[PDB]
Amino acid sequence: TGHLTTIRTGLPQATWRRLYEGVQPAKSTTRQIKDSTGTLEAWSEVDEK
Amino acid sequence: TLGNTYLTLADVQKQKDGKGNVTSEIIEMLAETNPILEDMVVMECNDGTGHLTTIRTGLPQATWRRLYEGVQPAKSTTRQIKDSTGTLEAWSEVDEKLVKLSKDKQQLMLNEAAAFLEGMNQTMASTLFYGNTATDAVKFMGLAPRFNAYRAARNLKPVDTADQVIDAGGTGSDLTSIWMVVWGDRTAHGLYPEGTSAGLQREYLGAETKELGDGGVYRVVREKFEWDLGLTVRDFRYVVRIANIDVSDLQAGTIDIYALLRKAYYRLENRVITGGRAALYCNADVTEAMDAAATPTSSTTASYVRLTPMQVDGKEVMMYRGIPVRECDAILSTETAVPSVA
Amino acid sequence: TSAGLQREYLGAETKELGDGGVYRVVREKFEWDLGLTVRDFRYVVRIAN
Amino acid sequence: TLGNTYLTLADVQKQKDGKGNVTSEIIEMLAETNPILEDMVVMECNDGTGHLTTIRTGLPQATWRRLYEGVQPAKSTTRQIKDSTGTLEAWSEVDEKLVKLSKDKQQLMLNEAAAFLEGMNQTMASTLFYGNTATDAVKFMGLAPRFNAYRAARNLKPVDTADQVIDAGGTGSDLTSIWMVVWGDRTAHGLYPEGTSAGLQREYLGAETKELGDGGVYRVVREKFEWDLGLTVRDFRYVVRIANIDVSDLQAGTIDIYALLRKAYYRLENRVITGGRAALYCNADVTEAMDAARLTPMQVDGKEVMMYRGIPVRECDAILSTETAVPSVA
Amino acid sequence: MIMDKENTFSYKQAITGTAVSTNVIDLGVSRDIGKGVPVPIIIQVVEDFADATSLTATLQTSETENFSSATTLATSGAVPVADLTAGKQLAVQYMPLGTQRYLRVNYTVSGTATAGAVTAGVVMSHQQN
Amino acid sequence: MIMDKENTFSYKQAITGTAVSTNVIDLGVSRDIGKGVPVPIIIQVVEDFADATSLTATLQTSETENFSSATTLATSGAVPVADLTAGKQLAVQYMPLGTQRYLRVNYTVSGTATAGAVTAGVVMSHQQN
Amino acid sequence: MIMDKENTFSYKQAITGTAVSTNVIDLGVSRDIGKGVPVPIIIQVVEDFADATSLTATLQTSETENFSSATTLATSGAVPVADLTAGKQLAVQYMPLGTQRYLRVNYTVSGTATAGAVTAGVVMSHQQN
């Protein structure tokens, strides 16, 4: 269904973990954008004789 | 609400090609380059409370001895300063079925690991250049907090660090700065506490068994990402930064870069003797303007540089005065005013 | 789809008319479809006006 | 103030015994037999997100050529349907010291795993028959909600789900239903998604350490059980439902099952599928009502299997006999 | 269907009155996630409606936790209660385009209701027939 | 966009004045499209517009070849005059659910413009960006 | 600079009034932590103060969980609202002698403070300018 591309649109914000303190995990926030083709075509009949 | 904390299903759908396989090639489009963490020297603290710096704050100035006079013996005073290291880490939490239904585990781990590596590198460079632990109690002192004050006059010898910052007349939220650090055993360097290891350490914890507060045991998988370091600017004669560099200018011909850079070069009181490797880090706006004022074409009422054919475009900005110019993306073109010490 | 500007020498044909007419023709067909799919506009910059 | 949450000493004392250790013979007293789980085939979800299916919908119209006359090209229009899936899991929890305290660990988990297997079989059969995505979006749609309607007069050709449901007539809170299905790759089968294995997946997570609101960490052994299963109706003309069978009028002589069965067989599609098992799915009340004495069983090793016109009659304990009335699409 | 907890707007929410959704999916970055590979969504009504009259089912998106100014990405219209049975979908199949910052579902109802529930949220793959 | 004739609602059709799609799709029998595999469509404005207040491109379907039983599968809404610009995808990214024998596109414009065009149909792979 | 969760008397704790510490520390047996090798402590002020008059940085210790009986170990006097900025320590860098069983920090203020924060607690390595 046409070539797809995967942009990354955000990154985690890590925290300075003081000892014995919990860190809340984060995720890689990606994003997608797809593209398509398009055809050109020409013909020529030239009366073989 | 939320939906931003853990790796939801929508993201996994977004991270795969149309064939139904996870994407190997992910366009980052948010990665940054920061060779400060690459060229920096770092070694274990390997001591007690912390890294120790000994600064002299007194000299036993001699006395003009008259004949038949008792010169009073004098002593040399010393001052000590210690700097500490900092630690941060980040975690990845994903459902195991989120992995299994994606038909590919190692690819998802690779994608998330690369993203986390980039995120930590960016965060670390940001804190190195701005470690304002004055209001944090973590995020070890960087470079801007030490020099976040300039002295307009009296800047003859480095009595304080307010003589190591050069005003440039800037105003507004469009200010920036240029750092010229010298990495060396005595000049300045990075630091990590003993027992740990240098660089980013990553650990694959495998499948977990996340237990909920209200009786829930859904199975997750996590990876560990750990990296700790600290700074120690032994001498404030080895670091000079320019404050109030208004980017409303520096794009037009109002502030000359090389004027300020020479002024700062001479403010660097310890380039007269080799202490260690030097550097001059920028934010890629300064370097753009620097090539705009070093290979001038139709510039504004300036630029005594005279060009020749084949040299009309520009070549590079690699070295300032023999100091390598490493371009660090951590620096921001918004830094707020650095005030004038009265 | 094959890569790049294609070319197909179909050879001789028949070209049947709409009134029973018939005479040989030879047809050469040129085809090309592509899409540029700038995957990271970070790698592209434009100066306009 | 109870003792039923996790496995306790009482249970192991009651199962692991026999003047010794764990027994390998735990009798499944609650073991409702659902041969639907055995007859039904399974197939990996090759597509990836929702088992897909291509069904022919239009047919080309051939032609007779008349002394070199042209034949127009013909299309063949196709419909396509997606069959989502669903997952069930379960988790065992025994204190590690409790497991070690019993002489055996493998068997004391094996019987606890057989328990979970039986529970998953029961729940999956129940949801296979009466499983609705309409109310439980986390439940893969079963056989019933795809047919909760019926046409008054059947169309000339099956063109809808409602055209494959026979209204046996009835009301109240005692009606039941009968299913005639053919299990086949082109008819109907189970679905274990990609990556996920087929059927139940027992997973033994060794030993782990727990927590509470105030520390109190203790060692637990956790067995993870999972089963993914999707249901697809390929060529739905192979599934016919006889709805609103009043069990009260069925126990008495008011309605005969044989008329309903013959009507359903009329409304079925002739078996042409290769490798496709087929069966009847009727509760125990229906086969009890088959006490009407030439329709006869057939020779398969002399087994307790009725063979109504070359079709095994698998009596399924999961077919609940208090369904809701099936409406008519007038 | 394998519809999950987090990216889910409402789970069996009655919204019998003129209420709104509860789990406002918030994303810090304007991904506008519909682009490229699709993402299936449902606003399927999960249990019947008794005495309502219309169930405008907007998909309001805004740029603040509180939707001070919201934007519509899918509206079902004034669906009469005669269709608000189980399985009555109320918007398009896949994710729309234009999800700027925040996303909450509105449930404007003409009059009140004594019964009604929905299960609006993101689904891995739709269930059809 | 790999468009195609024999599956196109209208090729470069002018919009000025209330009118319908020049070509009406005919799927042989009244079977369904939107279900199962997604089918992208783009009822998108191609050429700019004029004083016309709005535009109401709706995807009407009907069992009969001529549309006497209107059925809105999806509606563009009353898009304002300002947004009638080239490249505006006026309706859903994918084909809505419930396709009958025939489908049309109905253009209802508040007032009449001196400019405006639309190319609507099903594409092989809807091209983003 | 490394810190802990337990060995931490406060973390950006508000002092909008004559407040006291939050995380009172226990040490099992009574013991004396000031003896032997020094153990650092940081009483750095965060979130620069606005309208206070004097910040009393008493370091009360007790033998009971409730500080019915308290034993002052250090103080900083009536440090004015002026100064009290970020990075301003307000007690001895290390733990004084006489840590009976528990420890806490008192924050007596001669008036009302509309801002202010503290980070009292043990630090693995003191940070000297």
Which of B217, B218, B221 is the best mutation test for D, with the most CBs of D within 10 A? Answer: B217
CA quadruple F25, F27, F30, F32: dihedral positive or negative?
negative
Q: Chain D residues contacting E, CB < 8 Å?
A: 49-50, 81-87, 132-135, 137-141, 146, 161
User: Shortest CA distance to D191 belongs to which of D50, D294, D317?
Assistant: D50
Half-sphere exposure of D235 (CA within 13 A, CB side): 18
Query: Helices marked H in chain D — which ranges?
Result: 9-15, 36-39, 96-101, 106-129, 247-251, 257-267, 284-289
Number of cross-chain residue pairs from B and D with Cβ atoms under 8 Å apart: 23
User: In chain G, what residues touch A21 (CB-CB under 8 Å)?
Assistant: 4-5
Length of chain G: 129
The Cβ of residue E47 has, within 10 Å, a number of other Cβ atoms equal to 16
Contact criterion met (CB < 8 Å) for A18 and G6: no
Is B29 in the C-facing interface, judged by CB distances under 8 Å? yes
Q: How far is CA D323 from the centre of its chain?
A: 16
Which residue's structure tokens are 């306790």? D8
Instruction: Tell me if B215 sits within 8 A of B247, measured CB to CB.
Output: no
CA distance D70 to chain B (A): 42
- Contacts of residue B213, defined as CB under 8 A and 6 or more positions apart, other chains included, come to none
Instruction: Tell me if D199 sits within 8 A of D273, measured CB to CB.
Output: no
The Cβ of residue B322 has, within 10 Å, a number of other Cβ atoms equal to 7
Report the amino acid identity of residue B96: E
Residue F89 per-residue DSSP state: B
User: In chain E, what residues touch B2 (CB-CB under 8 Å)?
Assistant: 6, 23, 25-26
Residue D257 per-residue DSSP state: H
CA distance E90 to chain A (A): 26
Between B257-267 and B286-294, two packed helices, what is the crossing angle to 10 degrees?
110
Which of B29, B30, B33 is the best mutation test for C, with the most CBs of C within 10 A? Answer: B29
Which of E29, E39, E94, E97 is the best mutation test for A, with the most CBs of A within 10 A? Answer: E29
The shortest CB-CB distance from A9 to any of E31, E36, E37 is to E31
Q: How far is CA G32 from the centre of its chain?
A: 18
Structure tokens at D149: 């309607």
Domain membership of residue E79 as a residue range:
1-129
Length of chain F: 129
Pairing of strands D87-91, D78-83: unpaired
Q: Tell me the β-bridge partners of A45.
A: C27
Distance CA D147, CA D143 (A): 7
Which of B23, B25, B27, B288 is the best mutation test for C, with the most CBs of C within 10 A? Answer: B27
Distance CA B147, CA B267 (A): 13
Structure tokens at D246: 């009043």
B/e letters for B329-342, b = 16+ CB within 10 Å, e = fewer, are bbbebebeebeebe
Burial class (CB in 10 A: 0-12, 13-18, 19+), B222: middle
B/e letters for F24-35, b = 16+ CB within 10 Å, e = fewer, are bbebeeebbbbb
B/e letters for B146-176, b = 16+ CB within 10 Å, e = fewer, are bbbbbbeeebeebeebbbbbbbbebeeebbb
User: In this complex, which chains have at least 3 CB pairs below 8 Å with chain D?
Assistant: B, E, F
Contact criterion met (CB < 8 Å) for B222 and A5: no
User: Shortest CA distance to A43 belongs to which of D298, C29, B284?
Assistant: C29
Distance CA D179, CA E121 (A): 33
Q: Please give the torsion angle defined by the CA atoms of residues E8, E9, E11 and E12, in that order, rounded to the nearest 10 degrees.
A: -150
User: In chain B, what residues touch A25 (CB-CB under 8 Å)?
Assistant: 5-6, 90-93, 222
Distance CA F76, CA F110 (A): 13
- Contacts of residue G109, defined as CB under 8 A and 6 or more positions apart, other chains included, come to G15, G17, G18, G52, G53, G54, G55, G56
User: In chain B, what residues touch G48 (CB-CB under 8 Å)?
Assistant: 135
Residue of B nearest to D213 (CA): B213
Instruction: Tell me if E90 sits within 8 A of E105, measured CB to CB.
Output: no
Contact criterion met (CB < 8 Å) for B30 and A8: yes
Is B211 in the D-facing interface, judged by CB distances under 8 Å? yes
Q: Where are the domains of chain D?
A: 1-330
Instruction: Tell me if F100 sits within 8 A of F62, measured CB to CB.
Output: yes
Q: Annotate chain G with DSSP letters as a single string.
A: --EEEEEES-SSEE-SSS-B-S--EE-SS---SSSSS--B-B--EES---S-SEE-----EESSSS-SS-B-------EESSS--TT---S-SBPPS---SEE--B--BSS--SS-EE--EEESS----
User: Shortest CA distance to B95 belongs to which of B224, B212, B219?
Assistant: B219
Residue B120 phi/psi, 5-degree rounding, is: -65, -40
Is E38 in the F-facing interface, judged by CB distances under 8 Å? yes
Total domains in chain F come to 1
CA distance D218 to chain F (A): 49
Which residue's structure tokens are 């919201």? E70
Contact criterion met (CB < 8 Å) for E37 and A29: no
Could you tell me the CA-to-CA distances from D133 to D36, D37, D83, D246, E87 in Å, in that order? Answer: 20, 20, 11, 26, 8
Contact criterion met (CB < 8 Å) for D132 and E86: yes
Distance CA D44, CA D56 (A): 22
Sheet holding D208-209, edge to edge: D94-95, D219-221, D208-209
Which residue's structure tokens are 């994407």? B23
Q: How far is CA B194 from the centre of its chain?
A: 22
Q: Chain A residues contacting G, CB < 8 Å?
A: 18-21
Measured distance between the N- and C-terminal CA atoms of chain G, rounded to whole angstroms: 12
Instruction: Tell me if B150 sits within 8 A of B167, measured CB to CB.
Output: yes
Contact criterion met (CB < 8 Å) for D48 and B20: yes
CA distance E7 to chain B (A): 6
Distance CA D93, CA D8 (A): 10
How was this structure obtained? cryo-EM
Is B113 in the A-facing interface, judged by CB distances under 8 Å? no
Pairing of strands B42-44, B188-192: parallel
Contact criterion met (CB < 8 Å) for C26 and A46: yes
Instruction: Tell me if E86 sits within 8 A of E127, measured CB to CB.
Output: no
The Cβ of residue D263 has, within 10 Å, a number of other Cβ atoms equal to 15
CA distance F96 to chain E (A): 6
Contact criterion met (CB < 8 Å) for G1 and B146: no
Q: Is B326 helix (H, G, I), strand (E, B) or coil?
A: coil
Instruction: Tell me if E107 sits within 8 A of E18, measured CB to CB.
Output: yes
- Contacts of residue B240, defined as CB under 8 A and 6 or more positions apart, other chains included, come to B164, B165, B166, B180, B264, B265, B267, B268
Structure tokens at F92: 């859903």
Could you tell me the CA-to-CA distances from A12 to B116, B127, B251, F109 in Å, in that order? Answer: 7, 15, 33, 48
- Contacts of residue D44, defined as CB under 8 A and 6 or more positions apart, other chains included, come to D191, D192, D193, D194, D198
Structure tokens at B22: 């996870």
3-state per-residue secondary structure call for D91-119:
ECCEEHHHHHHCCCCHHHHHHHHHHHHHH
User: In chain E, what residues touch B6 (CB-CB under 8 Å)?
Assistant: 6
- Contacts of residue D165, defined as CB under 8 A and 6 or more positions apart, other chains included, come to D147, D149, D150, D151, D240, D241, D242, D243, D326
Could you tell me the CA-to-CA distances from B235 to A42, B38, B187, B221, G24 in Å, in that order? Answer: 74, 21, 6, 46, 39
Structure tokens at B15: 């991270």
Is E93 in the F-facing interface, judged by CB distances under 8 Å? yes
Instruction: Tell me if F29 sits within 8 A of F115, measured CB to CB.
Output: no
Could you tell me the CA-to-CA distances from A6 to B24, B28, B106 in Å, in that order? Answer: 10, 8, 18
Question: Long-range contacts for B269-273 (Cβ within 8 Å, ≥24 apart)?
Answer: B269/B157, B269/B158, B269/B237, B270/B182, B270/B187, B270/B235, B270/B237, B270/B238, B271/B182
Instruction: Tell me if G65 sits within 8 A of G102, measured CB to CB.
Output: yes
The shortest CB-CB distance from A10 to any of E28, E33, E37 is to E28
- Contacts of residue E51, defined as CB under 8 A and 6 or more positions apart, other chains included, come to E81, E111, E112, E113, E114, E115
User: In chain A, what residues touch F39 (CB-CB under 8 Å)?
Assistant: none
Instruction: Tell me if G48 sits within 8 A of G39, measured CB to CB.
Output: no
The shortest CB-CB distance from A5 to any of C30, C31, C39 is to C39
